[PDB]
Design a protein around this nucleic acid. Structure first.
Ligand SMILES: Nc1ccn([C@H]2CC[C@@H](COP(=O)(O)OP(=O)(O)OP(=O)(O)O)O2)c(=O)n1
Ligand SMILES: [Mg+2]
Ligand code: NA
Length: 359
DNA sequence: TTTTTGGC
DNA sequence: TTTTTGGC
DNA sequence: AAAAA
């Protein structure tokens, strides 16, 4: 009867009846994330997450009874929204100069919290002043971010995601004809838009040297076709908390990870002119065939669903879950699974469909 | 930097 | 008061 | 921020 504090024990579809509340909570979490106050950031993210799962809109304070992740601070924000249809706390964040600058600077691909603070303390407030400054030096990633800014700020839609899927499939099958390409992330959860397109590549017949060289061969193929705009391996990046999977280094050694920017020609997109092409972010994961169920679960998301699955495993089941395996800490054995359903069953959880993982 | 919960 | 909040 | 201990 009671709503669980874990997102892995709730069904969260794209039907949100509480957008007025969750938009204000996302603004407050984002402000704390950009300022690195991680404890309170997560508390606002959890509060936003549970409200997204509600099958009715909050219309009175009596509706917050028996709902987890709602303390005195979150209750006062909800109360304030019930009163005038707006949050005075979220409105102050939207008018904050540090929030506005950080939000704008980190909207450029390759700009992390350290670079955005650096620019803010120099007195910069706009992207035109940053781009035209005579002394500033930029990384190759930041250069791609500025050169393809308008295409990246506009999001990828489902027709564009499927056209990129065709490019990935053609390239992969040239080197591994038996390879299976699965679209993961937000698009797997039924989202109609995304900041990127995510893929999981697996091959039953591939060898260790073949698995380790596939992403190298795929990106070289795109480079020869004139489709590669930017490329980097995750091993040489160092990402901020928002993009950190929090996995063991021996777990990550098992996979091959690559992130690109692809030139997507309009003639490849089947949907409802300009330069005739659009720059698209693509994230690629190569995983060993035997670890495919754990990798599909881990890269489907959402971020909130993943971290609560692991928190539940640790604190409720005395288990250890990651993107390659499930370990029972008490019995000292690994639990085998060939499907996402088998993983949920080992955890003692009712199976949650990917379209219900939008926590 | 806050409050809540649950055994001592 | 100190610890956890997705890994060891 | 909000638990947990
Ligand atoms: N800190 C993070 C970030 C990501 N992920 C996982 C789950 C989703 C997957 C792909 O990540 P994103 O592309 O960033 O997110 P998304 O769900 O696809 O959403 P969008 O691409 O639309 O921002 O990686 C995670 O476990 N923890
Ligand atoms: Mg994505
Ligand atoms: Na960024």
């Amino acid at each position: 009867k009671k709503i669980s504090q874990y997102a892995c024990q709730r069904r969260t579809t794209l039907n949100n009846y509480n957008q007025l509340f969750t938009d204000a909570l996302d603004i407050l979490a984002e402000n704390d994330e950009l300022r690195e106050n991680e404890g309170s950031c997560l508390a606002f993210m959890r509060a936003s997450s549970v409200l997204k799962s509600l099958p009715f809109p909050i219309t009175s304070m009596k509706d917050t009874e028996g709902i987890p992740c709602l303390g005195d601070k979150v209750k006062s924000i909800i109360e304030g929204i019930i009163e005038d249809g707006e949050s005075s706390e979220a409105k102050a964040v939207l008018n904050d100069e540090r929030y506005k600058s950080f939000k704008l600077f980190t909207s450029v691909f390759g700009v992390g919290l350290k670079t955005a603070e650096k620019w803010f303390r120099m007195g910069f407030r706009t992207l035109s002043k940053i781009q035209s400054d005579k002394s500033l030096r930029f990384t190759q990633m930041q250069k791609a971010g500025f050169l393809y800014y308008e295409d990246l700020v506009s999001c990828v839609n489902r027709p564009e995601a499927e056209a990129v899927s065709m490019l990935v499939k053609e390239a992969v099958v040239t080197f591994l004809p038996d390879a299976l390409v699965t679209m993961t992330g937000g698009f797997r959860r039924g989202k109609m838009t995304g900041h990127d397109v995510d893929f999981l590549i697996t091959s039953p017949e591939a060898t260790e040297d073949e698995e380790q060289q596939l992403l190298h061969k795929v990106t070289d193929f795109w480079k020869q076709q004139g489709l590669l705009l930017y490329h980097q391996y995750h091993r040489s990046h160092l990402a901020d908390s928002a993009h950190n999977l929090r996995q063991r280094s021996s777990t990550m050694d098992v996979f091959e990870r690559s992130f690109c920017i692809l030139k997507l020609d309009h003639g490849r997109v089947h949907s409802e002119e300009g330069k005739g092409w659009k720059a698209i972010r693509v994230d690629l994961v190569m995983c060993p065939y035997d670890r495919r169920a754990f990798a599909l679960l881990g890269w489907t998301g959402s971020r909130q669903f993943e971290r609560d699955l692991r928190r539940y495993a640790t604190h409720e089941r005395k288990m250890m879950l990651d993107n390659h395996a499930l370990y029972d800490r008490t019995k000292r054995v690994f639990l085998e699974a060939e499907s996402e359903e088998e993983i949920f069953a080992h955890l003692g959880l009712d199976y949650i469909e990917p379209w219900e993982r939008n926590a």
